[PDB]
Design a protein around this ligand. Structure first.
Ligand SMILES: Cc1n/c(=N\[C@@H]2CCC[C@H]2CO)s[nH]1
Ligand SMILES: [Cl-]
Ligand SMILES: [Cl-]
Ligand SMILES: [Cl-]
Length: 163
């Protein structure tokens, strides 16, 4: 575990992370995809061998010894708000199980279902709160990655608010 488990936020490409493992915002088919998934495929393409997994689940594949946790959030274009909210909470619970199983002291994690799976809605708070609900019982250092300047400020505020 980390000596004083923390949350932090950085605004940069998650493919450049300084953590012991990465969470991919994956599609259910293990395809290269768009956005975070695209960046992860270019950096760790070996981790896409047999990475397909259903919505609301996470599947870890090693690239060398570096673990890539493929977490499949719902596409809010296809899910109702109710069923999508349940599946988005479930994906983060499965990430916390994998992070614990791997014994890592740190993890890089994007906000699931906030980009092309958002169904055109701002889901920063919804996605971040489900992240916290899952990760708060783990002792890994968590580093959240984002690309927008206003999102960086809002995620940083949400972390600082809890102290
Ligand atoms: C390469 C990179 N993308 C990041 N976040 C995405 C921005 C839009 C949806 C987000 C998650 O898919 S963090 N590092
Ligand atoms: Cl960058
Ligand atoms: Cl997304
Ligand atoms: Cl972002």
């Amino acid at each position: 575990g980390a000596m004083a488990p923390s949350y932090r936020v950085k605004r940069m490409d998650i493919a450049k992370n300084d953590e012991e493992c990465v969470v991919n915002a994956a599609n259910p088919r293990g395809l290269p995809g768009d956005g975070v998934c695209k960046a992860v495929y270019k950096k760790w393409p070996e981790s896409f061998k047999n990475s397909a997994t259903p919505v609301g689940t996470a599947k870890t594949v090693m690239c060398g010894t570096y673990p890539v946790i493929h977490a499949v959030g719902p596409n809010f274009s296809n899910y109702t708000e109710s069923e999508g909210d349940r599946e988005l909470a479930a994906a983060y619970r499965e990430v916390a199980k994998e992070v614990t199983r791997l014994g890592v002291n740190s993890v890089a994690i994007p906000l699931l279902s906030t980009g092309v799976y958002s169904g055109g809605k701002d889901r920063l708070t919804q996605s971040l709160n489900h992240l916290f609900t899952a990760m708060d019982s783990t002792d890994a250092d968590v580093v959240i990655y984002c690309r927008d300047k206003e999102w960086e400020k809002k995620i940083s505020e949400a972390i600082q608010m809890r102290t």
